[PDB]
Amino acid sequence: NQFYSVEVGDSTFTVLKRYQNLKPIGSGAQGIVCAAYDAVLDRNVAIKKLSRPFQNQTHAKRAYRELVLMKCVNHKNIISLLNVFTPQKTLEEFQDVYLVMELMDANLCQVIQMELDHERMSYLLYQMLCGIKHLHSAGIIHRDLKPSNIVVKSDCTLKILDFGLAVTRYYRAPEVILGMGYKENVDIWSVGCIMGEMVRHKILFPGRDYIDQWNKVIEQLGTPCPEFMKKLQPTVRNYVENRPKYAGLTFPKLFPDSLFPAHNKLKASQARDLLSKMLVIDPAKRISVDDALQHPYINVWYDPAEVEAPPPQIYDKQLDEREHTIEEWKELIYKEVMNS
């Protein structure tokens, strides 16, 4: 209806007038993101300007997926799209796409370094799991969970940003980092990387090449079982099979009482227990989302409304699948980018 410009680095953000006080909160390959005041909601929001949405066919497919994925989901633990607009008034001059989302205070990078009692820890992890489960029910496996795309508010609420997906390696599941396939509990690995790191205040599995990432896995978790190592392509296996053979450090050693709110013992053994089940190299031995939510450490928080909530749509397995011209991707995206 009416737009104005604000620079923002080398980029120009032309936005609806209701969005004011734009300042950069993050950037990368997806696009540049500002926090902004929304005059019409009297609330702060995040504006993302998509990075060259129509440079080529993968850029365009990625922008339409952002949008069709968003409008498969509606949950208190998932960042929702509030608005999308374009300053261009006709299909043929259309180029720029802005996504407007909920804003939070901070990512989990802050929080991992502080020192939480059990209810906050347990309550953050519970909200992470309700968000993850809602993604999975919609046909979305995230694969790229980590502290930086999990965002929080000073009222202790929490949302998961994109999905996944979309350097980032530390939190990626062994089935991923060894090119096996994956299913739903691939996100369970990552929750254990976050949780384990929340308790220990350092990255569970550092390095700097996958090579070194595998080292820290086995150094701490021991070498996996021989059967697991058959499932691996002859090439990954040869490598993996011929590394040093660790027994693993065990979970009491990795995460001793000294590291927790204490009795409170109980209690630490509940947290230790969940981690012993989440951080399991073999996805076939790893806890699922459901059992992690039914787990005594998380299950205190159980609400049917937050857990069993079905998604507005299950995501079209495929189309995923399906190509269009850049003229025909434009049409589909413009359609959304003024979709009322």
Partner: peptide, 10 residues
């Protein structure tokens, strides 16, 4: 069943 209401982001 009473959740935290605060998180020290300060």
């Amino acid at each position: 069943p009473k959740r935290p209401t605060t998180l020290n982001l300060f």
